[PDB]
């Protein structure tokens, strides 16, 4: 905990540009999401309070009050004081308020990670769940010290997309602003949301969710009438801004599958054109979400995945299931290939124009 306060940037992220400050919120929220994955938390409420603090309330089982025999303290204190983990959020807060409903209300206060008293019973209750409220230390965080609604909203919405049926509410008490995120459609609903202001060219969103060689692979995609590529890549719900081996495998499987379809069904022959990866990527919206037990990144930022085995897992699953999708949905296949041929014709005609005088 003293080591965390000494080098706060290492554990929570950049402590000056706002990255670290908002990651304090996301770490506490991630604990509530793990309970929702376990099947107990149905709703999470995140509130930005007027005094520049944030609270997160879940309706799960509540953190164990049962006391540790070796440590001699409540199991909730062990989670809050021992090593991202919630102890990091606790170490870098000037104050943190813990409230556990489990059928008794338990309360504890911390200051700079150190508890004022043990976890004591305050009253009685029928409900269940955990509440954590924290005041981030202004010794640690500089420049950007105030929480920003839109930064918390963007990530909690994607966390809803990424975690099947988890209700997340966001409340800003400074100005009354509210949001409720609860997308039951999941990453398929992510793609719908990403294409809501675009024009989708075919009705059936491609989707699968599989597990091979200890790697979870989940993909959704859909083409629009535009010419932009917009792939969003995730590893254990952490976004990779700069892609990596998940994105490579996705791209590899996709060029291979569509070319194989266009060759076999006789599209390439009739057109007299050879389609490339760039032709297929135009108008594409996609989300690639992988589950890796021990993932390797390029740096501590996790902007790029470098686990080489993830490429093969994504590539192989994509090849099989995208090929199944094309045959089973021939009208979608015909629209998408029609767009790809026209992009290939335009590119090849443009390349032919430069050389010809």
Ligand X SMILES: O=C(O)CNC(=O)c1ccc(NC(=O)c2cc(Br)c(Br)[nH]2)cc1
Give catalytic residue positions: 27
- Least distance CB 116 / ligand X (angstroms): 18
312-341 footprint of ligand X as x/- string (CB under 6 A): ------------------------------
- Least distance CB 147 / ligand X (angstroms): 17
Quick one: which of 20, 25, 58, 246 contacts ligand X (CB under 6 A)? 58
The residue range among 61-69, 117-125, 221-229, 334-342 that interacts with ligand X, by the rule CB under 6 A, is: 61-69
Quick one: which of 61, 68, 198, 296 contacts ligand X (CB under 6 A)? 61
Q: Would you say 168 or 285 has its CB closer to ligand X?
A: 168
Q: Would you say 54 or 336 has its CB closer to ligand X?
A: 54
Quick one: which of 4, 32, 337, 341 contacts ligand X (CB under 6 A)? 32
Rounded CA separation 301/72 (Å): 36
Tell me if 130 contacts ligand X by CB under 6 A.
Answer: yes
Quick one: which of 4, 45, 86, 253 contacts ligand X (CB under 6 A)? 86
DSSP string, 280-305: HHTTEEEEEEEE-SS--BSSTT--SB
Tell me if 28 contacts ligand X by CB under 6 A.
Answer: yes
Tell me if 185 contacts ligand X by CB under 6 A.
Answer: no
Structure tokens at 49: 């309070």
Rounded CA separation 290/333 (Å): 25
Rounded CA separation 124/143 (Å): 42
- Least distance CB 163 / ligand X (angstroms): 14
Quick one: which of 21, 26, 35, 250 contacts ligand X (CB under 6 A)? 35
- Least distance CB 39 / ligand X (angstroms): 11
- Least distance CB 309 / ligand X (angstroms): 31
Rounded CA separation 262/245 (Å): 26
The site that binds ligand X (CB under 6 A) totals a number of residues, namely: 13
269-308 footprint of ligand X as x/- string (CB under 6 A): ----------------------------------------
Helix (H, G, I), strand (E, B) or coil at 108: strand
The residue range among 28-36, 139-147, 175-183, 319-327 that interacts with ligand X, by the rule CB under 6 A, is: 28-36
Helix (H, G, I), strand (E, B) or coil at 49: coil
- Least distance CB 46 / ligand X (angstroms): 9
Which one-letter DSSP state was computed for residue 47? E
Rounded CA separation 348/356 (Å): 12
Name the nearest CA neighbour of 45 among 59, 62, 31, 35: 59
Name the nearest CA neighbour of 276 among 289, 292, 259: 259
Tell me if 77 contacts ligand X by CB under 6 A.
Answer: no
Rounded CA separation 341/275 (Å): 7
Residues followed by a break in the chain (C to N exceeding 2.5 Å) are 83, 102
Which one-letter DSSP state was computed for residue 239? E
Exposure string (b/e) for 33-58, b if CB count within 10 Å is 16 or more? bebbeeeebebbbbbbeeeebbbbbb
Q: Would you say 20 or 200 has its CB closer to ligand X?
A: 20
The residue range among 59-67, 158-166, 205-213, 246-254 that interacts with ligand X, by the rule CB under 6 A, is: 59-67
Name the nearest CA neighbour of 209 among 182, 224, 190: 190
Tell me if 63 contacts ligand X by CB under 6 A.
Answer: yes
- Residues of this chain that interact with ligand X (CB under 6 A) are 28, 31-32, 35, 56, 58, 60-61, 63-64, 86, 130, 132
């Amino acid at each position: 905990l003293d080591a965390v306060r000494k080098r706060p940037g290492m554990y929570i992220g950049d402590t000056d540009d706002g990255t670290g400050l908002h990651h304090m919120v996301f770490e506490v929220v991630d604990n509530a999401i793990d309970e929702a994955l376990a099947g107990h938390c149905k709703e999470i409420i995140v509130t930005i309070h007027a005094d520049n603090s944030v609270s997160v309330q879940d309706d799960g089982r509540g953190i164990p009050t049962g006391i540790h025999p070796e440590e001699g303290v409540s199991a909730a204190e062990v989670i809050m004081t021992v090593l991202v983990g919630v102890s990091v959020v606790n170490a870098l807060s000037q104050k943190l308020e813990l409230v556990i409903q489990r059928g008794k209300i338990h309360r504890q206060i911390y200051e700079h990670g150190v508890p004022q008293a043990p976890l004591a019973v305050t009253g009685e209750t029928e409900k269940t769940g955990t509440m954590v409220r924290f005041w981030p230390s202004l010794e640690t965080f500089t420049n950007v010290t105030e929480f920003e609604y839109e930064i918390l909203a963007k990530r909690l919405r994607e966390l809803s997309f990424l975690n099947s049926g988890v209700s997340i509410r966001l409340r800003d008490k400074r100005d009354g602003k509210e949001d409720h995120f609860h997308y039951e459609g999941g990453i398929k609903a992510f793609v719908e949301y990403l294409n809501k202001n675009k024009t989708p060219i075919h009705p059936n969103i491609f989707y699968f969710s599989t597990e091979k060689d200890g790697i979870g692979v989940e993909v959704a995609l859909q083409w629009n009438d535009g010419f932009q590529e917009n792939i969003y890549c995730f590893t254990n719900n952490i976004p990779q801004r700069d892609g990596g081996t998940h994105l490579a495998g996705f791209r590899a499987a996709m060029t291979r599958t569509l070319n194989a379809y266009m060759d076999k069904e006789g599209y390439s022959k009739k057109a007299k054109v050879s389609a490339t990866g760039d032709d297929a990527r135009e108008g594409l919206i996609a989300v690639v979400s992988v589950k890796v037990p021990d993932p390797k990144f390029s740096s501590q930022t996790k902007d790029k995945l470098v686990s080489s085995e993830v490429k093969s897992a994504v590539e192989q699953q994509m090849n099989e299931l995208l090929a199944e999708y094309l045959l089973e949905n021939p009208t979608d296949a015909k629209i998408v290939v029609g767009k790809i041929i026209d992009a290939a014709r335009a590119r090849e005609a443009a390349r032919r124009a430069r050389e010809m005088t």
